[PDB]
């Protein structure tokens, strides 16, 4: 019934740890300040160092962070579908959402700190700090699983834009904590309280410029009394080794009566594929690198999609199986998936409208208690055909709505889940 996670290796172990130097602060530079674009290869090459040498302890921590990441991802994915999110489908990144939540937790104090911990499904003992998550162990374990994911060009980049009102000063230890989540961190100041819509225009133009990513960011304005926005931007890029684009276009059914003609990619490899008898769906796994897997889930028929989605995406992956690979001809739409949601909305959908509300104790973020506006998570996920265009096998053809997940075998972390209703 009520599942609890007991991530012992991510807790504080020294009661004493939890007559003081005043904490140091800085003022972020204005959003207009000249900034070099993020180098996605420099980020990659680093994350790869941070997964290279790992003792047994590190893998124990990475296994426990995986469980909390997945569970919270499943819960927020459920919140996402209840709020409704565009016709093309849904997409969510548990590592990014989880990273966001842990960043706030690092800036928070009670009651907010234990409320974030409860959300994450870890028990709290009122009075006992050694039952509390150590956010630094958590972010460090999350960095390692990001590293394991990306071991030809296989990219995942997380960028954080931290937008504050003029005069709001950030605490040093807070921002140094955020660097563990991602080194690509841009604290910037701008006038939030006079033209919400142009403030969003500035953030969108800023993000496009430091990343070069074509993301379709939301255009809605910031609430005029916001002093802190915390936006997380995710770029995933994979190549399908040996898949190439097929000639012309092919029917993809949006539902039983409506089709769209789209470009498909196709490839033949040794993949794993099974049919689930109990619930009547099938699954295909294609490797993206040495540790990453793409899972493609097909309902037997279109009207069974919601039932299947709710089975499989909601807390262990009881349904992942490990059959012998077999010769498979896989045909699917080239995936260029864009998504964005405000964590505030998902939290409100989860009956926690005020967790990050006006009374949240976030006093470890800066010099005053911030007043948090949006907390966006945005994704660009790109699966590219590994080859240009121009033997017995089983045909799997994704020509109607399906679900997908990108998954890392060692930790068990789901890095993405989603649903394609209409590629376009």
Subset of 29-48 contacting a copy of itself (CB under 8 A) = 29, 35-36
Inter-helix orientation angle 40-52/135-149, to 10°: 110
3-class state of residue 145 by DSSP: helix
175 binds a copy of itself (CB under 8 A): yes
Tell me the β-bridge partners of 81: none
Binding residues for Na ion, total number by CB under 5 A: 5
Alpha helices in 299-411 (DSSP H): 305-312, 343-349
Of residues 311, 336, 330, the one with CA closest to residue 420: 336
Subset of 178-197 contacting a copy of itself (CB under 8 A) = 187
94 binds a copy of itself (CB under 8 A): no
Residue nearest to Na ion (CB): 135
Residue 368 CB: number of other CB atoms within 10 A? 14
Quickly tell me which residue has 């295909």 as its tokens. 284
59 binds Na ion (CB under 5 A): no
314/60 Cα distance (integer angstroms): 24
Tell me the β-bridge partners of 261: 251
9 binds, among Na ion, a copy of itself, none (CB under 5 to 8 A by kind): Na ion
- Is the distance from CB of 175 to CB of 164 less than 8 angstroms? no
- In the bound complex, what is the minimum distance in angstroms from residue 58's beta carbon to Na ion? 9
25 binds, among a copy of itself, Na ion, none (CB under 5 to 8 A by kind): a copy of itself
Alpha helices in 325-424 (DSSP H): 343-349
Quickly tell me which residue has 């009661």 as its tokens. 15
- In the bound complex, what is the minimum distance in angstroms from residue 302's beta carbon to a copy of itself? 51
Task: Name which position in 3, 8, 16, 21 contacts a copy of itself (CB under 8 A).
Answer: 21
328/244 Cα distance (integer angstroms): 15
Nearer to a copy of itself, 27 or 58 (CB): 27
Residue 327, sorted as left (phi over 0), alpha (psi -120 to 50) or beta, turns out to be: beta
- In the bound complex, what is the minimum distance in angstroms from residue 60's beta carbon to Na ion? 5
Binding residues for a copy of itself, total number by CB under 8 A: 15
133/115 Cα distance (integer angstroms): 12
27 binds a copy of itself (CB under 8 A): yes
19 binds, among a copy of itself, Na ion, none (CB under 5 to 8 A by kind): a copy of itself
Residue 306, sorted as left (phi over 0), alpha (psi -120 to 50) or beta, turns out to be: alpha
135 binds, among Na ion, a copy of itself, none (CB under 5 to 8 A by kind): Na ion
Subset of 155-184 contacting Na ion (CB under 5 A) = 172-173
258 binds, among Na ion, a copy of itself, none (CB under 5 to 8 A by kind): none
Nearer to Na ion, 176 or 303 (CB): 176
184/178 Cα distance (integer angstroms): 9
Task: Name which position in 24, 42, 224, 280 contacts a copy of itself (CB under 8 A).
Answer: 24
Enter the DSSP assignment of 206: H
Nearer to a copy of itself, 28 or 299 (CB): 28
323 binds a copy of itself (CB under 8 A): no
- In the bound complex, what is the minimum distance in angstroms from residue 26's beta carbon to a copy of itself? 4
389 binds, among a copy of itself, Na ion, none (CB under 5 to 8 A by kind): none
24 binds Na ion (CB under 5 A): yes
409 binds Na ion (CB under 5 A): no
397 CB-side CA count, 13 A: 10
298/21 Cα distance (integer angstroms): 58
- Report the interface residues with a copy of itself, using CB under 8 A: 19, 21-29, 35-36, 172, 175, 187
Residues in the site for Na ion, rule: CB under 5 A?
Answer: 9, 24, 135, 172-173
């Amino acid at each position: 019934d009520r599942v609890y996670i007991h991530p012992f290796h991510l807790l504080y172990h020294n009661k004493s740890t939890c007559e003081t130097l005043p904490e140091s602060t800085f003022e972020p530079v204005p959003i207009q300040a000249k900034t070099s674009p993020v180098n996605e290869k420099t980020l990659h090459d680093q994350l790869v160092l941070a997964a290279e040498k790992l003792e047994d302890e590190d893998r124990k921590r990475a296994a426990q962070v995986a469980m909390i990441t997945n569970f919270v991802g499943f819960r927020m994915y459920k919140m996402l579908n209840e709020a409704g999110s565009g016709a093309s489908g849904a997409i969510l990144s548990p590592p990014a959402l989880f990273g966001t939540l842990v960043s706030f937790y690092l800036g928070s104090l009670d009651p907010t700190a234990s409320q974030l911990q409860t959300l994450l499904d870890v028990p709290v003992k009122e009075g006992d700090c050694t039952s509390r998550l150590d956010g630094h162990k958590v972010l460090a374990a999350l960095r390692a699983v990001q590293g394991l994911l990306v071991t030809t060009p296989l990219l995942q980049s997380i960028v954080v834009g931290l937008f504050t009102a003029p005069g709001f000063r950030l605490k040093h230890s807070f921002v140094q904590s955020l660097a563990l989540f991602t080194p690509a961190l841009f604290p910037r100041s701008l006038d939030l309280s006079t033209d919400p819509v142009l403030a969003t225009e500035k953030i969108n133009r800023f993000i496009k410029a430091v990343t070069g990513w074509k993301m379709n960011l939301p255009l809605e304005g910031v609430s005029t009394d916001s002093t802190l926005l915390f936006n997380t931007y995710v770029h995933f890029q994979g190549t399908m080794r040996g898949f190439s684009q097929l000639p012309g276009v092919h029917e993809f059914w949006v539902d039983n009566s409506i089709s769209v003609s789209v470009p498909m990619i196709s490839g033949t490899g040794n993949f794993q594929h099974w049919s689930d008898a109990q619930n009547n769906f099938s699954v295909t796994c294609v490797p993206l690198g040495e540790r990453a897997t793409l899972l493609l889930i097909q309902p037997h028929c279109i009207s069974d999609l919601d039932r299947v989605e709710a089975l499989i995406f909601q807390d262990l992956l009881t349904w992942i199986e490990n059959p012998p690979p077999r010769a498979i001809r896989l045909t699917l739409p080239q995936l260029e998936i864009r998504g964005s949601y405000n964590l505030q909305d998902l939290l409100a959908e989860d009956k926690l409208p005020t967790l990050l509300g006006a009374e949240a104790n976030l006093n470890n973020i800066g010099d005053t208690n911030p007043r948090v506006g949006e907390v966006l998570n945005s994704i660009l996920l790109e699966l590219k055909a590994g080859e240009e265009e121009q033997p017995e096998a089983l045909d799997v053809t994704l020509s109607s709505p399906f679900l997908f997940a990108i998954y890392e075998q060692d930790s068990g972390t789901l890095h993405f889940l989603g649903r394609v209703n209409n590629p376009q």
